[PDB]
Design a binder for this molecule. Sequence first.
Ligand code: NA
Length: 127
Amino acid sequence: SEVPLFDINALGDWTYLGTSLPAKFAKLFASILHCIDDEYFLITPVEKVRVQVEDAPLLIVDFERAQPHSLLNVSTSIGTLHHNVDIKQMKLTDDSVYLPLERGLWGKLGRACYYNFVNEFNLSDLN
Ligand code: NA
């Protein structure tokens, strides 16, 4: 065990060595976060380290289509922004809905945007 030094809880909040990271620090580290074969890492040339993730690495708190019927832009609780997000590729558990983002990362839909997400569906999203 490399016990991971970075932890992301189910609500998307990060710690390092057990200390809470401010959102902007979580956003800095998220820029180099990947999920490879179901395991999470921060990846740089010199340092490649593990991250423990309770649920999803990112919590989606807002979304919009760039244009009618387009793919989605989403933003997260730590302030990251993601483009070209495809409703058709969503994944459900019995508890939550997840959307696929870059670098193998999935974003969990936050409770406060759930109903708005359901309302957003267009039949064209299945095309
Ligand atoms: Na709709």
